[PDB]
Amino acid sequence: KLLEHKEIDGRLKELREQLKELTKQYEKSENDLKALQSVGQIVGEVLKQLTEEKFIVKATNGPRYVVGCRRQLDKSKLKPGTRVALDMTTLTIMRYLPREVDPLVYNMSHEDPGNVSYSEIGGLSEQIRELREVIELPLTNPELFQRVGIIPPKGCLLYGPPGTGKTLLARAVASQLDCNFLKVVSSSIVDKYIGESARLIREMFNYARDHQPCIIFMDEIDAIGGRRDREIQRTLMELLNQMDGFDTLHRVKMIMATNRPDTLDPALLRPGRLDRKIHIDLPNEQARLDILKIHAGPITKHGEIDYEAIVKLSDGFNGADLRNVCTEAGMFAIRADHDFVVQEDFMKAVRKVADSKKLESKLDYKPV
Amino acid sequence: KRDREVQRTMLELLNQLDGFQPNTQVKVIAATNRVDILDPALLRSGRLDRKIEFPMPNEEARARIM
Ligand SMILES: Nc1ncnc2c1ncn2[C@@H]1O[C@H](COP(=O)(O)OP(=O)(O)OP(=O)(O)O)[C@@H](O)[C@H]1O
Numbered sequence A: 001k002l003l004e005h006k007e008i009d010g011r012l013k014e015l016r017e018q019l020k021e022l023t024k025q026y027e028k029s030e031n032d033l034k035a036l037q038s039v040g041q042i043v044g045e046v047l048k049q050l051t052e053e054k055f056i057v058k059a060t061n062g063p064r065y066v067v068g069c070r071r072q073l074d075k076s077k078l079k080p081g082t083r084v085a086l087d088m089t090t091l092t093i094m095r096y097l098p099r100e101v102d103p104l105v106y107n108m109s110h111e112d113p114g115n116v117s118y119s120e121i122g123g124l125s126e127q128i129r130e131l132r133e134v135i136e137l138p139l140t141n142p143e144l145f146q147r148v149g150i151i152p153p154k155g156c157l158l159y160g161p162p163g164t165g166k167t168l169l170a171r172a173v174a175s176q177l178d179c180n181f182l183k184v185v186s187s188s189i190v191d192k193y194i195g196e197s198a199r200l201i202r203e204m205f206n207y208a209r210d211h212q213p214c215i216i217f218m219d220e221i222d223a224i225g226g227r228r229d230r231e232i233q234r235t236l237m238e239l240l241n242q243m244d245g246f247d248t249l250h251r252v253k254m255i256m257a258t259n260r261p262d263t264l265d266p267a268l269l270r271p272g273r274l275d276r277k278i279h280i281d282l283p284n285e286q287a288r289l290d291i292l293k294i295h296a297g298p299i300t301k302h303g304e305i306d307y308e309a310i311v312k313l314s315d316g317f318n319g320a321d322l323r324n325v326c327t328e329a330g331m332f333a334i335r336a337d338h339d340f341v342v343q344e345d346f347m348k349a350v351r352k353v354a355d356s357k358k359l360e361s362k363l364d365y366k367p368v
Numbered sequence B: 001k002r003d004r005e006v007q008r009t010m011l012e013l014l015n016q017l018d019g020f021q022p023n024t025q026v027k028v029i030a031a032t033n034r035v036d037i038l039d040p041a042l043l044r045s046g047r048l049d050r051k052i053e054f055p056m057p058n059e060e061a062r063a064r065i066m
């Protein structure tokens, strides 16, 4: 008798479970239909309050209006520069939002910088120490700075030949410090809309101040930091003004990277904006050996590898050149169908990358 | 090598190809006749790992072409 009872009871249980699921989609349908009745609200930044009731709000890029708080919102918190939402019928203020992220700035913060560590970067121990003293120590350990009274340097700029690792160094700093990191190619900040770039960089610095401890990195800064087309200079003025707005308390730091520091306008080169300069020169003999060891580490070689002879031959090479040496040795192995790599592959790769650098008619490069 | 906008475009090309997590599965191929013009910016070993010279076609190469 228990089989029929179990059949009907299990059917009942399954039916009630399906009924709970069905009531769930019913509630979802009612919730989204109730949502459909909702009406959006116009966003906008605020301005001077004339009285305890009437305020001036600059509705987005549109015109500014004289409006009022609804009835219940705060009055002391509404100061010039608070993002507020406005009704589209009487334009009154309700639901004053914290601030805008400017989704581009969202992208430049939550962008993967890699798992690079200080170990993976080699040959710049002096530069790594300087940068960590300028950007890491003031952030992680401020009490030394405030008690001692030292104004921490606002930012540091990195210059050198292409492929020396400035960007790699910035990536390592981003990856190893548990913080909020901002990186954006300078060329991308420039926009064809009127004055959009100045508002872009203003909102980037506002986000950095909002999301301390925040770190903003500049690569190819000479795109906009170049010597005095019109919007470039207009946004450079905004850059100078905004980063002159760094208050001593702020846990925000600046890194600019470039390949032609001479083109940079001396305006940034002045003290008070960009004090500490770091030169990442072509890797030295021991530096080249260290970089080569780092890059050839994970490869599956067989037998002894004479890194010293390679470093003897690899004159004028940069870190990217050594990475190419490793890659071309790997490709000689892959063409020869060796499951491994030998010293001869590294030899051939060094010679090949040397012929490639022959093409590299690198013009002499000069600091700031 | 170093208008201003062409510079901006080529800087964007440089950093969408070498900096801050490139690669995944995008491979670029570059062709030009004036390699002396480009010099310092793009030709970096990190950016264009291979530099493939196309020589003046050889005797047997010319015969094969015809
Ligand atoms: N000292 C080094 N140790 C290890 N790898 C290095 C070193 N220097 C350069 N490299 C490698 O060479 C390449 C250079 O890339 P990167 O963009 O960091 O160069 P860069 O000199 O900072 O150029 P740019 O300022 O134009 O971005 C990277 O793949 C990096 O891993």
Ligand SMILES: [Mg+2]
Residues within 6 Å of the ligand: A166, A167, A219, A220, A257, A258, B019
């Ligand atoms: Mg760089």
